[PDB]
Design a protein around this ligand. Structure first.
Ligand code: KVS
Lengths: 99, 99
């Protein structure tokens, strides 16, 4: 699909058998979702935003469905105001910015 | 142009007669530029995201050239780590997210 930006580009994702809302975020290097239970061991990572840095838990090779497209990659878990799908997974679904 | 997301989608912009590099960010409601001088009166505003909130100055009716495309809208000025072009101006250049 082609998505205009008059409204926030929110989509439905499926992770860990749950449906959650997420923002398609070209301004994010990585993908971050709010606190949830994910399988496997995690590693520590620090990420920065407009207001500074936060500590998140990094999980690898997580299966996640984004607006119907399956992706398998790195997901960070932490205190983010909203679930964000970043470039790491956007490239997997073949997303591009056009104008 | 069609912009892939293997890398950060940065583009050249022209504001206040100055050339700057900016990030095309579908995850940003507004446009935030690094500390610089702009004409007119402004209002204080607080914007947030990952890491918390920061204080910016809001200037309205500012003309900005985004990668060649002239647009007009509100521009926030503050201590941002990177110049961000949000949806308020992305819509004006007809930018879309395709996948
Ligand atoms: C420095 C600012 C870079 C811009 C983006 C912003 C954004 O991710 O698009 C987020 C996503 C939405 C909320 C989480 N948008 C925002 O943060 C924007 N917020 C908003 O639009 C709304 N705010 C809220 C809280 O809803 C609006 C209501 O104000 C603001 C820019 C203000 C309009 C951002 O935070 N990117 C992080 C995402 C986290 C991540 N790791 O992917 C990033 O890539 N950080 C990189 C490097 C960033 C560049 N380097 C640096 N010097 N910090 C990193 N690896 O840590």
């Amino acid at each position: 699909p082609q998505i205009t930006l008059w409204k926030r580009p929110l989509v439905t994702i499926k992770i860990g058998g749950q449906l959650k809302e997420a923002l398609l975020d070209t301004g994010a290097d990585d993908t971050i979702i709010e606190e949830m239970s994910l399988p496997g061991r995690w590693k520590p990572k620090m990420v920065g935003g407009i207001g500074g840095f936060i500590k998140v838990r990094q999980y690898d090779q997580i299966i996640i469905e984004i607006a119907g497209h399956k992706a398998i990659g790195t997901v960070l878990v932490g205190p983010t105001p909203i679930n964000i799908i970043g470039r790491n997974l956007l490239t997997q679904i073949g997303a591009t910015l056009n104008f």
